[PDB]
Design a binder for these strands. Structure first.
Ligand SMILES: [Cl-]
Ligand SMILES: [Zn+2]
Ligand SMILES: [Zn+2]
Ligand SMILES: [Zn+2]
Length: 122
DNA sequence: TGCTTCCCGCGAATAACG
DNA sequence: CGTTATTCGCGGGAAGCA
């Protein structure tokens, strides 16, 4: 295909034939390989930019709307992504949101049309 | 060296198939 | 049309960048 398989200790890795990156999941290799082949394009709906992964485009479009989905539950401040939220909580509140810490709320995305995870609304 | 974007295992949502 | 196949949102560490 666009990969070969490597097997060590009875565990299978899928290896990208172009850059030789390894993947535990074949769907991950397929997702990655678009970067090489560009057989699918994900163009921004607000500007001319085009991305090789759907999620890169989504994260990018959020910047166009200015929606702040990530909210610190200690002081209420909201942030556009996980990284700014995490940086805030570690720096201002001296706490780590990783694991399940319940230190932040991820609101559903309302400023554009993306797939909605049920767990975000209740 | 602090933003900024990328990366990939995981699995819920949904499209494609029957 | 219920069943499987596919897509891609999410965490949170890594890498890129000026
Ligand atoms: Cl908002
Ligand atoms: Zn590759
Ligand atoms: Zn854009
Ligand atoms: Zn806060």
């Amino acid at each position: 295909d666009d990969h070969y398989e490597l097997i060590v200790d009875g565990r299978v890795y899928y290896i990208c034939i172009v850059c030789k990156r390894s993947y535990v999941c074949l769907t991950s290799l397929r997702r990655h390989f678009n970067i090489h082949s560009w057989e699918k394009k994900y163009p921004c709906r607000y500007c001319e930019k085009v991305f090789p992964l759907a999620e890169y485009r989504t994260k990018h479009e959020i910047h166009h709307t200015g929606e702040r989905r990530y909210q610190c539950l200690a002081c209420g401040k909201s942030f556009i992504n996980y990284q700014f939220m995490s940086s805030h909580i570690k720096s201002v509140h001296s706490q780590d949101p990783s694991g399940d810490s319940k230190l932040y709320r991820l609101h559903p995305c309302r400023s554009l049309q993306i797939r909605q995870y049920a767990y975000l609304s209740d």
